[PDB]
């Protein structure tokens, strides 16, 4: 059989860190639209995170307030999380996240890096 751990903490309180991982995937529901993205609401969290239109959809982007709408869920990404004691930043991906089994599409988390490209 396969020797290893599986787990030791059982049940976790709520604390300052909700949030999920760096580069976890989620199901959450759009709370607020934006002509330049939409937010979202993490399961068991305290703060919600914005996806950028550039985000919001892998082809081009012209109109983000149709692609989605407030009670609509959807799976997400964390590509960026930041937080201050001034305040708090969370930055949300979804067209690197699969919509219907919510299955990571990018495992290479480049693109949501300001990289040099063509056209």
Same mark, same amino acid.
């Given at each position: 059989?396969?020797?290893?751990?599986?787990?030791?903490?059982? =049940?976790?309180?709520?604390?300052? $860190?909700?949030?999920? /991982?760096?580069?976890?995937?989620?199901?959450? $529901?759009? /709370?607020?639209?934006?002509?330049?993205?939409?937010?979202?609401?993490?399961?068991?969290?305290?703060?919600?995170?914005?996806?950028?239109?550039?985000?919001?959809?892998?082809?081009?982007?012209?109109?983000?307030?149709?692609?989605?709408?407030?009670?609509?869920?959807?799976?997400?990404?964390?590509?960026?999380?930041?937080?201050?004691?001034?305040?708090?930043?969370?930055?949300?991906?979804?067209?690197?996240?699969?919509? =219907?089994?919510?299955?990571?599409?990018?495992?290479?988390?480049?693109?949501?890096?300001? =990289?040099?490209?063509?056209?």
């Amino acid at each position: 059989g396969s020797s290893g751990s599986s787990g030791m903490n059982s =049940g976790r309180p709520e604390t300052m $860190e909700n949030l999920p /991982a760096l580069y976890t995937i989620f199901q959450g $529901e759009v /709370a607020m639209v934006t002509d330049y993205g939409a937010f979202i609401k993490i399961p068991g969290c305290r703060k919600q995170g914005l996806v950028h239109r550039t985000h919001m959809s892998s082809c081009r982007v012209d109109k983000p307030s149709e692609i989605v709408d407030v009670g609509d869920k959807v799976w997400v990404k964390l590509i960026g999380r930041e937080m201050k004691n001034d305040r708090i930043k969370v930055s949300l991906s979804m067209k690197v996240v699969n919509q =219907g089994t919510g299955k990571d599409l990018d495992p290479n988390n480049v693109i949501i890096e300001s =990289g040099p490209s063509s056209g």
